[PDB]
Design a protein around this nucleic acid. Structure first.
Ligand SMILES: [K+]
Ligand SMILES: [K+]
Ligand SMILES: [K+]
Ligand SMILES: [Mg+2]
Ligand SMILES: [Mg+2]
Ligand SMILES: [Mg+2]
Ligand SMILES: [Mg+2]
Ligand SMILES: [Mg+2]
Ligand SMILES: [Mg+2]
Ligand SMILES: [Mg+2]
Ligand SMILES: [Mg+2]
Ligand code: NA
Lengths: 197, 153, 260, 171, 84
RNA sequence: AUCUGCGCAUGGCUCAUUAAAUCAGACGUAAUCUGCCGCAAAAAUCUUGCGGCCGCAAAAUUGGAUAACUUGGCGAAACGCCAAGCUAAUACAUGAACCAACCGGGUGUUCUCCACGUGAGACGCCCAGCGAAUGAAUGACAGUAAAACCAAUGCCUUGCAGUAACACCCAGCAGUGUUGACUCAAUUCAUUCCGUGCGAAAGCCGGCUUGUU
């Protein structure tokens, strides 16, 4: 079947390699997952040694981490907005490592309110900072003293969608985990998205 | 209130995908003090063994190279070789020559032979044609590349 | 995987005749490396002569009459190796597998309270789950809580019956060692110095009792005592002293003529 | 009986090799330095059994002991250790009500939720310990123990350290 | 009902042969947990809990050794500072 | 006889292909997979039986199927085949509370106290096993000497000598993994694992002294 060997390749001299053996199972490749955005569907793959890879065909949710807050939440995948390989992967809503996605910002907004006592949804189920023990208020002040959130993420939370980068490999593990874009990386990709509306 | 994030450096980011180090987070609001250089920026660097000094460009530079042995996960193990730079026309890759004399027993005499090796060159070196370099064996980095430049003499 | 072992391909130290059989017993995986081990069947049939052939060797071994490190081993393909203690309680036999000056395996007879002690060279040190320090020895043993001063290359003298470490001898200059590999295998000497070549093989320079200086790779040395005077284990008859070949031939000839 | 070259095995109960021959009163040891165990004929028999032999992993010499059994430092002492008095929740005035009637010389609190009280009489310290051990104070179960410390040594140290404090102040 | 004797009601088939004593074939009862089996099952849990508690004891001894060594170094340092 | 478990990827044969291939000596895999064999590790789990989710009790007395076999058999034959009826396993599936520990994280608009909140202590609640995934922090230091100010906090007594750290039940229950070099070993925090993982095989056999350890 599909092979990964260098036998079919040309030599650096440009000569043709004369193959004198049949293909081996130890050098095989598999067809790509081509994971798309949709309701969860996975297919186990028995790999060498009896271990199983999880070939995800469709994924809709994953663990997305806020690095500066050192937290993570299970959130819904809303859209795929940018892919550095080609825009056809964006058009087909393919999920691969390092692609840029938009995920639901509600769990991150709610955690901020619970952990810092700051409700980002000012000026308009939902945690209320008023119902807090006086000890929790003091811990809120202690956490809030050495803390500065960036406006770019803060604005994205307000709109309900926040951009993130996939950090896992859905074709190998069957997961769509990621990390929220921050700082210069967010500004880079915001400029890429700003190009052509 | 609000956090002052670092700005995009256009001199480095021209690859259609954001260039970054995988070992560290450059956006960390509180630097860990472990991987901070003299300029205050966060930059991953490691010491390779065998008594090789990590170049200052690696320590306090701005380049992003996932194949550099001083700022990435590429490790040096196996053979350590010396050679002469033969060509620098590729991006981050150089061709070196190893000239040597081969002995022929029947005639009790030598002949001049040479071998060519494709070697990855980190942006921290900048060697020229005719320069002498020290190269360390690493994992396969391309179809032909098996060595990384360690020192330019 | 490979299940057979041609007799020509078998280690020469097993002393199996090239004309008697096509195959030799292939050692199973286990405590010692295949090239650096003595199979139990070879020990029971070719060395101890208790078994005339393999079928009698199977008779002895399957009954658990042969103990290795205070544990009956019923497989003739079990890979017994260096410093192992082999005991047959029925015949009252107790010996340690060691190397003589010529590099061959030797059955050095042991007394009681000596068969309970075995030396193990630490080959690796790692951390297990729960932050538990683990030492891996030359015979495949894993020690769950070694001495905090233990280092790679050191030797742990270990009570087999009670399954506990009782002492540690560090790998330093001036210590007595025995060579376990190479052309110098079986020689006993004192560490003069160790040359360090990072990323390559360290070289240990040793000096025996007679003053002869020799060398080998650091992986082939095995610390066995504080110095040459006080060893922590019984050694073979020749005491690890290489002897000049011309003088050895002359002494054997004189001894033969004295006999006749 | 006195034993030379005790070696390792500092555990007092690990000296039961003498306990095998006859009962042991106390064992005072200093690891490899020495070890003394604490009728007379039985000790002599244990001397013949263990001396000049590598027992317990080292050569032990059971010599007759010229040292009396060590006195417990807790006995005849005028200081008491009290737990779990919590300083952030209890004031010194409320602490003294626990000691009311007994009368004290000195009171000190520490961050480990324990207090040291120096009483005037060893009998007062002994009576307080026996009648207040396992009692209830300030919403917690109490724990009082006779302390081997002494107030006269602390005052001597304070006088000796005052000179250093004054000299460093002038420095 | 439970606690009854299942061995009493097993089906026995009679085999008749001329000159033979009419062997009565009955099966061997499976999953018949005897008091011996109950003891064997209970011993497994006893050994398992004993082993983990033994490991905790070894962990305690090793931690004590490390802590005591650091304590000895600390107070030796204090003694040297005072003695000079 | 037949289910189950292991092997049949070894041996034996041959030399057609094959020149940056194969092979030899010498090295690498920190770029990985690895049954059998050796030495080790294992505290996740709401189960069962009698009565009405609740109570009492504890050596867990778990559940469905399918071979051989029986019946009817198809087919010229086929290391070819149906259908029905039985019954097992260390096959397959399910599932074990208390006994039984140490440790941590988040909290209650809950109590008992101190000062007028880097306060303390309890109880209540949700998580806290191996392995796996993502993110965060560790995985060391090793290029200089003295003084004051304030806030809190340690001692000393009612101002800093002395002082490993730590608000009790543990006053030393890791301040210290490894390599030549690691994003590795390992630990802590957050979130996750949906079958593509994890029984004490709910297993077998002996010895006596016959043993709800
Ligand atoms: K089968
Ligand atoms: K033939
Ligand atoms: K378990
Ligand atoms: Mg059964
Ligand atoms: Mg073959
Ligand atoms: Mg070779
Ligand atoms: Mg449990
Ligand atoms: Mg027919
Ligand atoms: Mg099974
Ligand atoms: Mg883990
Ligand atoms: Mg370290
Ligand atoms: Na190496």
């Amino acid at each position: 079947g599909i092979v990964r060997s260098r036998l079919h390749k040309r030599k650096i001299t440009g000569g043709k390699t004369k193959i004198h053996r049949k293909r081996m199972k130890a050098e095989l490749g598999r067809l790509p997952a081509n994971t798309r955005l949709g309701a969860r569907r996975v297919s186990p793959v028995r790999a060498r040694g009896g271990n199983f890879k999880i070939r995800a065909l469709r994924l809709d949710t994953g663990n997305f981490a806020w690095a500066s807050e050192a937290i993570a939440h299970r959130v819904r995948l809303l859209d795929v907005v940018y892919n550095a390989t080609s825009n056809e992967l964006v058009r087909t809503k393919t999920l691969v490592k390092n692609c840029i996605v938009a995920v639901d910002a509600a769990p991150f907004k709610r955690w901020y309110a619970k952990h810092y006592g700051i409700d980002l949804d000012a000026d308009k189920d939902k945690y209320d900072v008023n119902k807090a023990s006086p000890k929790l208020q003091r811990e809120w002040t202690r956490r809030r003293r050495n803390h500065r959130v960036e406006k770019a993420i803060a604005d994205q939370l307000r709109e309900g969608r926040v951009l993130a980068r996939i950090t896992s490999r859905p074709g190998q593990s069957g997961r769509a985990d990621g990390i929220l874009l921050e700082g210069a990386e967010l500004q880079f990709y915001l400029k890429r998205l700003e190009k052509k509306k | 209130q609000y956090y002052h994030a670092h700005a995009v450096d256009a001199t480095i980011q021209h690859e259609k995908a954001y260039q970054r180090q995988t070992a560290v987070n450059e956006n960390m609001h509180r630097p860990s003090r472990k991987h901070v250089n003299k300029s205050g920026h966060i930059r991953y660097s490691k010491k390779i063994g065998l008594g090789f000094k990590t170049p200052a460009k690696a320590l306090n530079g701005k380049y992003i190279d996932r194949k550099c042995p001083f700022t990435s996960n590429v490790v040096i193990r196996g053979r350590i070789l010396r050679g002469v730079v033969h060509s620098t026309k590729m991006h981050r890759t150089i061709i070196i020559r190893r000239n040597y004399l081969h002995f022929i027993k029947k005639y009790q005499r030598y002949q001049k032979r040479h071998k060519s090796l494709a070697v990855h060159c980190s942006p921290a070196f900048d060697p020229k044609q005719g320069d002498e370099v020290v190269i360390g064996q690493c994992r396969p980095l391309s179809k032909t590349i098996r060595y990384n430049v360690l020192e330019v003499v | 995987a490979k299940k057979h072992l041609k007799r020509l391909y078998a280690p020469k130290d097993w002393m199996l005749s090239k004309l008697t059989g096509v195959f030799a017993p292939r050692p199973r995986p286990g405590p010692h490396k295949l090239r650096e081990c003595l199979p139990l069947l070879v020990i029971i049939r070719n060395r101890l002569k208790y078994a005339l052939n393999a079928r009698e060797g199977e008779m002895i071994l399957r009954q658990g009459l042969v103990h290795v490190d205070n544990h009956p081993r019923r497989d003739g393909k079990y890979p017994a190796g260096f410093m192992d203690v082999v005991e047959i309680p029925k015949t009252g036999d107790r010996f340690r597998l060691m190397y003589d000056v010529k590099g061959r395996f030797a059955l050095v007879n042991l007394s009681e309270a000596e068969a309970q002690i075995k030396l193990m060279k630490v080959v690796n040190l790692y951390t297990a789950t729960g932050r538990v320090p683990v030492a891996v020895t030359h015979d495949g043993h894993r020690i769950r809580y070694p001495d905090p001063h233990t280092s790679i290359g050191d030797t742990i003298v270990y009570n087999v019956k009670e399954k506990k470490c009782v002492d540690l001898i560090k790998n330093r200059q001036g210590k007595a060692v025995i060579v376990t590999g190479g052309a110098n295998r079986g020689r006993i000497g004192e560490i003069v110095k160790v040359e360090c070549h990072p990323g390559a093989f360290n070289i240990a320079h040793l000096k025996d009792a007679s003053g002869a200086e020799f060398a080998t790779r650091a992986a082939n040395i095995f610390v066995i005592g504080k110095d040459l005077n006080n060893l922590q284990v019984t050694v073979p008859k020749q005491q690890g002293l290489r002897m000049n070949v011309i003088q050895e031939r002359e002494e054997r000839l004189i001894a033969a003529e004295a006999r006749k | 009986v006195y034993v030379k070259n005790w070696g390792t095995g500092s555990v007092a109960d690990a000296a039961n090799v003498f306990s095998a021959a006859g009962k042991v009163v106390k064992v005072q040891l200093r690891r490899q330095r020495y070890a003394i165990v604490f009728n007379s004929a039985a000790v002599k028999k244990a001397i013949d059994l263990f001396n000049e032999k590598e027992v317990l992993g080292k050569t032990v010499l059971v010599v007759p002991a010229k040292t009396s059994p060590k006195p417990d430092a807790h006995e005849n002492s005028s200081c008491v250790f009290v737990s779990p008095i919590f300083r952030p929740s209890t004031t010194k005035a409320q602490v003294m009500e626990l000691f009311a009637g007994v009368k004290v010389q000195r009171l000190r609190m520490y961050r480990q939720n324990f207090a040291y009280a120096y009483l005037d009489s060893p009998a007062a310290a002994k009576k307080f310990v026996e009648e207040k051990n396992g009692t209830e104070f300030r919403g917690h179960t109490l724990r009082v123990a006779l302390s081997a410390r002494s107030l006269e040594k602390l005052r001597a140290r304070q006088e000796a350290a005052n000179v250093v404090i004054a000299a460093h102040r002038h420095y | 009902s439970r606690t009854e004797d299942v061995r009493k009601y097993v089906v026995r088939r009679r085999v008749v042969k001329s000159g033979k004593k009419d062997r009565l074939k009955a099966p061997k009862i499976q999953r018949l947990i005897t008091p011996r089996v109950k003891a064997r099952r209970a011993k497994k849990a006893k050994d398992a809990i004993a082993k983990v508690r033994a490991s905790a004891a070894e962990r305690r001894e090793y931690l004590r050794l490390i802590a005591s060594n650091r304590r000895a170094l600390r107070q030796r340092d204090h003694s040297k500072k005072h003695t000079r």
